[PDB]
Amino acid sequence: MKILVRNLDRSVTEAEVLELFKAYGKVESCVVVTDKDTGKSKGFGFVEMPNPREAIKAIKGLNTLKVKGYGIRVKAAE
Structure with missing residues (x-):
């Protein structure tokens, strides 16, 4: 399951987000965008958890x- 993450502060890192989703299950990939082109509020992320029941829990x-x-x-992205 593909998961969309939004409202990330520019200080949020990929490893920060990864650690959060890993509380719920296996994470296959974690892409986090927190640039200066995003605001300290409007960063976003895309997380893949292959077990959909774990994704839903997260x-x-x-x-x-x-x-x-x-x-x-x-x-969920879907």
Whole structure:
């Protein structure tokens, strides 16, 4: 399952996001975009968890979690 992550602070790192999704299951890939072209609020990420039941658990678990002061938004790409 492909998972979309939004509202990332420019200080959020790929390893930070990875550690969060790994609380829920196996993570096959984690792409995080926090540039200066994104704002300290509008970074985004794309996470692949191959077990869809783990992905769903992570979506429910992590959506609206504050990371660096912004509630992140997590949902399936589909």
